[PDB]
Design a binder for this molecule. Structure first.
Ligand SMILES: OC[C@H]1O[C@H](O[C@H]2[C@H](O)[C@@H](O)[C@@H](O)O[C@@H]2CO)[C@H](O)[C@@H](O)[C@@H]1O
Ligand SMILES: OC[C@H]1O[C@H](O[C@H]2[C@H](O)[C@@H](O)[C@@H](O)O[C@@H]2CO)[C@H](O)[C@@H](O)[C@@H]1O
Lengths: 376, 372
C-alpha cells in the first residue's frame, strides 16, 4: 500500500472502465492503481478496515457509508467550493454524515422496468395485470417477469408502493424506533409477490444472474434492474424499453435511490493520492465516460457529463423512477436493516415463514434474528 | 509460524501464565508471548475474522459459541485419557453443536467479599443493606461497592427473584423466550437503582473504584470473583468470602463461567497450542503457577482441585455457583451482554427507567445500542 492505490468496487459496475482510468493515472504519475471487485465487499471492507487494512478507496451506494463513518473507517474529505460546484447538491447531501462529507459522489442509481418490446409491445401500468399476462405468455412457453429475489433492493419498490417504509423521516432526522417494514402497505406489497410465486408466475430462487440470462436470451418479457445492466442487454440485441415501474393498488412503485459513492480509507497512507485520483481523473467527463462505456452509471453527479447523458430516455426513465422513490438513509442501522429484510423476503418467498411473520421479524428483530446468529 | 501468542484478560493470572510459557520455551525452544489487551473479547473476533490474532484465546465459555459459529476456532481433540482428567460439567461448557471447541480451565462464580473488622456479621438479605449503609455512613464508611459498568456483577440480583436470559427447555435454549424484563428482573434491578437513588451506591463505580475502596478499607463489602483475592491478600484487609445476599428470600443466582482456552482456527501452530495446553498448562504445576498469581477459582483439573477445594474461599465460590447457573454459549450471547450492559448503566444513571431499560434488553430494536 505504501505508495500505490488499491480500489474496491462491485462486480456489477464498470470496473474495467475504471481500471482504464487508473492506467491513465499511473501513466501520468507513475503510481500503480489496482482495481478489485471481491465478492461481498460491502461486508469485507468494514472487516479488513476494522484492523487498519483494506483498499485505499471503496465504492458502494451511499447507504452504507454512514456506518463506516460511525465506525471511523472513512477519511473526511475536503473539496473546495470550486470542486463542489461541479456536482449536484443532492449528490453531496447523500454523502454528508454528522455534518461531515465522508465520500465523493459518483452517480445516481434507481431501478426501472426493462421490457422486451417485441413479445410485449405494451408494458403493464400495474402489477395487478401480471398473472393474467404471465399466463398468456406461457402459451408461447415464456414468462412475463424475472428479477433478483435474493437482494431485497429489487423487491423494495413494490414493498414501498402502498406505504412500506424503512425508518420514518421526521423534520431533520430519521426515527429509528418507527419502522415501516411490517405495516399493511409493506405486507400487501410482499404478499403480492409471494402469490406470484405461490402461483408460479415467478420462481422463488431466481437470482441476479438467472434474471439477467433469462431476459437477455428473450426468455422472459420483463426484468427489474438498474443502469449497469443496459450494457449486456445491448450485447444480446434484445429490443428493450426502459420505463416506469408498474403501480400497485394504483400507487407508484417507489425504488430506494442510491448514490454510488467513493470513500477514502481512514487507515490509508495514500489519502492525498486518492484525492488527486478521485478529483482530477475520475470525476471528469473522460474519467466517467470510460466507466460509463463499460457499464452505465445512471445519472452522474458531474453536471458537465450529465448534460449529455440526460438526453437518453433510459436516463430520463431512471430519473422518473428515482422521482417516485426515496433517497436511501445512510444511518448506521442500514446494514442490519438490509440483512433482516433480505432474509424476510427470502423466507416469505420460499414458504419458510409467512408474510406477516417474516416482516414482523424484519421490523423488530429479537435475539432469534439472523443479525445475531453470528453466522459466517 | 513457529511461535505461540496468547491473549488472556487483564484481571486473570497472566504473569503466572507467562511463567508456564517460559517453561514451554525452555523445553521446545518455541517462544510464548502472553498479552492481555483491553477489550480482548471484542478484539479477538475482529482480528481473527481476517486470519490474524493470537494462537490461543482465554475467556469465559459464554463467548466461544459465537467464535465457533463464526468459524474462528479449531475443534480440539483430547483423547479419552486426557478427558477423564477434567470434570464432565466443564467439558459440557465448551461443547458446541456436539464438538469440543476449547479446553476448560476453571470454574468462576461471584461471592460476597466482606471486611470482618468493619462488619463481623455480613447481611443475609439485600434488603438490610440500606439500613446498614446508614450505619456505616456515620462512621465515614459505606456498606457495599461493586462494578456497575459490567452487567455480570448485577446478574445475581436480576436473577434472584426470576430474571433469566434465554429459557432453557429440554436440552435447549429458546432464543425467542427472553426473561430479562420479566417481574423478577424488574424487581432485582429496581432494588439496585433504589440503592443508587438513595445514595447507598454511586452509579459510576467501576471495577477499579470498587476494588480500591474495599482494599483500602473504605467499604465493608464488595462482589467479586476468585481472581480478586490476591490484591486483597496484599492489602492486608481481614476478609471473608461468603454466600451472596438473598433477595425477597431467594438466593442470588450468579451466572457461572468456565475460563477456557480456544485455539485460533487460522493458527499455523495448532499442534504446539495443543502440547502447550495439554502438557504444560493443564497440570498441577501449570495451574499452580497461574493460581499463585491470581486465583483461578475451582479448577477443571481434578488432580489440582483436590488441593483447592479445601480452601474455605473455594467452598463459598462453589456454594454461590450451585445456587447460580452455567452461562449459555449460544452465539446470541455477545449481543445479549451488550443490551443488558446498556440497560443496567442506563437504569442506574437515570437515562432510562428500569421497565424501559429492560424492555429494550429483552427485545433490541433498531434503536438499540447493538445497532449503532
Ligand atoms: O439488497 C440490499 C442492498 O441494496 C443496495 O445494493 C444495491 C446497490 O446499491 C446497487 O449498486 C447494485 O449494485 O445492486 C445492489 C443490490 O444487489 C444497497 O446499496 C445495499 O447496501 C443493500 O445491501
Ligand atoms: O459483564 C458481562 C460479561 O460477563 C462475563 O465476563 C466476566 C468474566 O466471565 C469473568 O472472568 C471476569 O473477568 O469478569 C467479567 C465481567 O467483567 C462474560 O464472561 C462476558 O462475556 C460478558 O461480556
Amino acid at each position: 500500500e505504501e505508495g500505490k492505490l488499491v480500489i474496491w468496487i462491485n462486480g456489477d459496475k464498470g470496473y474495467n472502465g475504471l481500471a482504464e482510468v487508473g492506467k491513465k493515472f499511473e501513466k501520468d504519475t507513475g503510481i500503480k492503481v489496482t482495481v478489485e471487485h471481491p465478492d461481498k465487499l460491502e461486508e469485507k471492507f468494514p472487516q479488513v478496515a476494522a484492523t487498519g487494512d483494506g483498499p485505499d478507496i471503496i465504492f458502494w451506494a451511499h447507504d452504507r457509508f454512514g456506518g463506516y463513518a460511525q465506525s471511523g473507517l472513512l477519511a473526511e474529505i475536503t473539496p473546495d467550493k470550486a470542486f463542489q460546484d461541479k456536482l449536484y447538491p443532492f449528490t453531496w447531501d447523500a454523502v454528508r454524515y454528522n455534518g461531515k462529507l465522508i465520500a465523493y459522489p459518483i452517480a445516481v442509481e434507481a431501478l426501472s422496468l426493462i421490457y422486451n418490446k417485441d413479445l410485449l409491445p405494451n408494458p403493464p401500468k400495474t402489477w395487478e395485470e401480471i398473472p393474467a399476462l404471465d399466463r398468456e405468455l406461457k402459451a408461447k412457453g415464456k414468462s412475463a417477469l424475472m428479477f433478483n429475489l435474493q437482494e431485497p433492493y429489487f423487491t423494495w419498490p413494490l414493498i414501498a408502493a402502498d406505504g412500506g417504509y424503512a425508518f420514518k423521516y421526521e423534520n431533520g432526522k430519521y426515527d429509528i424506533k418507527d419502522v415501516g417494514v411490517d405495516n399493511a402497505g409493506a405486507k400487501a406489497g410482499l404478499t403480492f409477490l409471494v402469490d406470484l410465486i405461490k402461483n408460479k408466475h415467478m420462481n422463488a430462487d431466481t437470482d441476479y444472474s438467472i434474471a439477467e440470462a433469462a431476459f437477455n436470451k428473450g426468455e422472459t418479457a420483463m426484468t427489474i434492474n438498474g443502469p449497469w445492466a443496459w450494457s449486456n442487454i445491448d450485447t444480446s440485441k434484445v429490443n428493450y424499453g426502459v420505463t416506469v415501474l408498474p403501480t400497485f393498488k394504483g400507487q407508484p412503485s417507489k425504488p430506494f435511490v442510491g448514490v454510488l459513492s467513493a470513500g477514502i480509507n481512514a487507515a490509508s497512507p495514500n489519502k492525498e493520492l486518492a484525492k488527486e485520483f478521485l478529483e482530477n481523473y475520475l470525476l471528469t467527463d473522460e474519467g466517467l465516460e470510460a466507466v460509463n462505456k463499460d457499464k452505465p452509471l445512471g445519472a452522474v453527479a458531474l453536471k458537465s457529463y450529465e448534460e449529455e447523458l440526460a438526453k437518453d430516455p433510459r436516463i430520463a426513465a431512471t430519473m422518473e423512477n428515482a422521482q417516485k422513490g426515496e433517497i436511501m438513509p445512510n444511518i448506521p442501522q442500514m446494514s442490519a436493516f438490509w440483512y433482516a429484510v433480505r432474509t424476510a423476503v427470502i423466507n416469505a418467498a420460499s414458504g419458510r415463514q409467512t408474510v406477516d411473520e417474516a416482516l414482523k421479524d424484519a421490523a423488530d428483530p429479537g435475539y432469534d434474528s439472523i443479525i445475531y446468529r453470528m453466522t459466517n
